[PDB]
Design a protein around this ligand. Sequence first.
Ligand SMILES: Nc1ncnc2c1ncn2[C@@H]1O[C@H](COP(=O)(O)OP(=O)(O)OP(O)(O)=S)[C@@H](O)[C@H]1O
Ligand SMILES: Nc1ncnc2c1ncn2[C@@H]1O[C@H](COP(=O)(O)OP(=O)(O)OP(O)(O)=S)[C@@H](O)[C@H]1O
Ligand SMILES: [Mg+2]
Ligand SMILES: [Mg+2]
Lengths: 432, 432, 86, 87
Amino acid sequence: MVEIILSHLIFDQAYFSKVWPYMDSEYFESGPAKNTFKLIKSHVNEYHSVPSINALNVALENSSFTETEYSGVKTLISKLADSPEDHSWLVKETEKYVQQRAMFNATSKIIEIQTNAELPPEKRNKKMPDVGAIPDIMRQALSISFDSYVGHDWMDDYEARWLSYMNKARKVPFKLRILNKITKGGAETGTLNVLMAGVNVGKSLGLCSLAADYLQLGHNVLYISMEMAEEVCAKRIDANMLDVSLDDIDDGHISYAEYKGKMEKWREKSTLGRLIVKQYPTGGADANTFRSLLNELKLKKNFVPTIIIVDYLGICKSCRIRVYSENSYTTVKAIAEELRALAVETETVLWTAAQVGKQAWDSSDVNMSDIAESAGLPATADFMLAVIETEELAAAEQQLIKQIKSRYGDKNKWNKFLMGVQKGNQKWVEIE
Amino acid sequence: MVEIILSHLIFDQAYFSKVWPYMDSEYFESGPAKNTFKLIKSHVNEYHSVPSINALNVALENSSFTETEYSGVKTLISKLADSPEDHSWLVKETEKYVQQRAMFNATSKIIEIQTNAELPPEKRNKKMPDVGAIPDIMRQALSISFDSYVGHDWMDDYEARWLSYMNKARKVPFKLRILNKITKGGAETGTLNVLMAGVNVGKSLGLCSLAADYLQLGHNVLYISMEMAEEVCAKRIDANMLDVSLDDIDDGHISYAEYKGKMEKWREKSTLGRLIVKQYPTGGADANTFRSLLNELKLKKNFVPTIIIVDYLGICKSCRIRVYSENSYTTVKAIAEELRALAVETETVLWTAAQVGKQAWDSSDVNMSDIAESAGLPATADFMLAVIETEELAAAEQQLIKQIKSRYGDKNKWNKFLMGVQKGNQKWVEIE
Amino acid sequence: GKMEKWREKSTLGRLIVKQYPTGGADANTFRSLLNELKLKKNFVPTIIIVDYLGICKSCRIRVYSENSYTTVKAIAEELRALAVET
Amino acid sequence: MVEIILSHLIFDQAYFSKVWPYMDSEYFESGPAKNTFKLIKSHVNEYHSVPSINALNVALENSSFTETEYSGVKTLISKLADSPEDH
DNA sequence: TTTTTTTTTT
Ligand SMILES: Nc1ncnc2c1ncn2[C@@H]1O[C@H](COP(=O)(O)OP(=O)(O)OP(O)(O)=S)[C@@H](O)[C@H]1O
Ligand SMILES: Nc1ncnc2c1ncn2[C@@H]1O[C@H](COP(=O)(O)OP(=O)(O)OP(O)(O)=S)[C@@H](O)[C@H]1O
Ligand SMILES: [Mg+2]
Ligand SMILES: [Mg+2]
């Protein structure tokens, strides 16, 4: 049914718009269909417009086809006449035909490779790849996109925009009321959020608390620890969930009976996600390793996270440059860009913590210029919180959170607010 | 690798238990391998235990097939030896072989289906799958892999994590009341512990004292001196262990009789550990050099250290920054990260020392900002003790210790505590 | 009601919003996007607005063959060349 | 004496202890010996242990090698055996 | 070899 495909490519515009990128010369035939599709594709890539019948004829005249190909293309172009068909049905049939033809090409290549490899080494040909590259061509036949989004037309796509507005398909709510009220319903899907604070003042504590809350809200959470082992972060999360004090696990003040009892009482709830903690060596993992980790989790453990928390994002590799090849600014900006690209690609909320230069350690006020590792991070950041803590504030068992950078709302409404962080329990609560 | 797989299935149990389920009768061959695996699977089904060579022989005897196949399988069970290869390599190569054989079977089925399709409809078998069934089997070719430990799940790994809780895994006691009290059972294997003090305050004294304390408690210590020679470090260890003042060691007050007697007395103590001292030129020690000499000499001296000490962290050499760099911050941070990574890879407590800034030499208190030569070190350090010295405390033979940073406990609970120092004895004592 | 009221106006143009991965887009990628908007739709922009220039990737430098003042300036020159060309 | 060197690398543990870290790929020849030591290097860098004969000629030795050099490599692997003498 | 950057220290 290639003739219908070509006729609707030429005479229809919505049809051409819907499925251009999945049209390839290897999908029709070795005869007139491929030739006329080559004509169409040449005109398209040359003039950036759907050719008309006159344009196709003109391209035919100044071509290098023999008599047989000329006659076939001329007849096929003559047959091209517009007909009324269902748009969705046409799209579905195009998907079916493209899938079937890709599978046919794949299996033909498989036959060729297997048959030639069966031959003795002298009889076989080196022009054709060995059996080793069977799976890739086997998996490329199943990796056809079939969906292409060119842009968000402001006037033509206001229905979907309003559906996203009312449905809040982007916001991911917190468990703290103050965070929701300052972020207008939580953090969005493809975003990078930052906790800015000094050394040993509650960065990883805050990230573990956020991970615990997300896990409580039925979310698949992937905690990527860079400074402490898997058991340490899992112990912090255990202290947060089971309400066991962190000192108690060390001192053995909790019996295995009660620990297992509350573990069971947590595991029975259906409002509980899956948490996978994956520590990497300090400065030894990159965004490509993160993507491979996601792929392996999905394939083996059937795990696709919705929240990915990376504690101390700074100690990574940019995956584009050699490690320590550049200065701190360049490599950190590249790592942050890769992290936000991963967040937008997987539509996963990405939380992290930022180091602060010595000029703001033990200081009651923290600004965005006080960030240490780079200035390419705050530009790439969608939300930053200062987690300041002075001696007096630490005495009162609280931290001063400052909204130094907010893209979800105005950062001058509730700029200062106190948070009741419980240092022992690795969890913070709202003062209200 | 049919022979290896069959052998380690018959003999090994860890290999058998790790991957029994990912084994199909059609993975092996059309000849003797399939028959032997059929016999193994039949024996496992009849009796839920791994068979033995005699069991395979008798099962072959009571089996019935062609005499040529009988001889082939009998010869096949004549070569299955123990051959204890590595288990990780075993499972990895078995996974590779299984994936290759699954790919071969899928390819063969695809060829058969395509050949059946390219036939007149009269001469076709309806039992054969249609062309449309080809894609899904391709997924069955790609969706084959052994389950592997990807991350640390917080729920379905809680029992092992509790095992790591009740067992004080990754803990090394200190033989000192305040140290074990503040670290909640010693430092953890694969961490960074640092002493920050001014110039000539007792950093090397402290490291030697810790090395001796570990040596008493049956610990192997890899001392790496960057400033002092091996003889000097051995002398400091002697002064700490034998309670001989540094004056008496080089003034001749120590006699060979007493020295020999005390040495043999410590030799008879089976609780005594093993200590070595490797010296490197100032700024000429590398992480790769750490592993090399230990690797070959580990075979040569059967010595593996629980505690690795690197004197004067600030004057080491990086294994990633190839050329010398004037930037203190980047180089020192990279060196600290390299040290922490080496410690975690070897799973051994790493101790070091650090230099305070020029402004902290005359100060009675030391802050974390007053560190020198970098700010990446306080970020990479799991534990930091400031050895504060002042004239009044020096007169009282006491040095203040202030836990600047602690990931083992709360650094505000016992932040400041006096520790008695015997500089002549080069020893640490706890004030009661 | 407001959307349809704006659509009723004959003085209203067209707005196309396209998001690119941070670092993934390029001046040649921008040109390909313009060609795609001319092909798929009848859209030929008169105003092009980019949130930030330096995020993009140079079409001539491979990845980071040189420093910041060889890629950022190259992208700026490529974007001005795009403006002149279109 | 590359054959003796590789034989004692594979079979003698004490020899591997004092001689392997000072060994390199380009220290034997450009023929089969280089390929054999490359296989050994890959195995040791992948598992931190000396490969067995089976781990060498079965798991490896099935890489992208031409027949002329693959035959030589398998011949070299065949002629490997321990030699009793002092370390 | 020009640049841009974060940084420690006189
Ligand atoms: N194991 C622990 N037991 C008890 N309290 C702890 C423990 N670890 C940390 N704390 C407390 O939590 C505070 C912050 O700890 P962290 O979670 O490491 O915050 P941090 O800022 O990420 O630390 P770094 O190493 O600078 S990133 C410390 O100052 C202690 O008061
Ligand atoms: N051989 C020695 N004899 C007597 N006292 C010594 C000796 N070595 C060090 N000390 C004393 O021990 C204290 C500092 O010793 P060390 O630990 O060697 O110095 P440090 O902490 O390593 O600082 P550095 O490395 O010299 S900048 C001072 O009070 C010295 O007087
Ligand atoms: Mg922390
Ligand atoms: Mg000293």
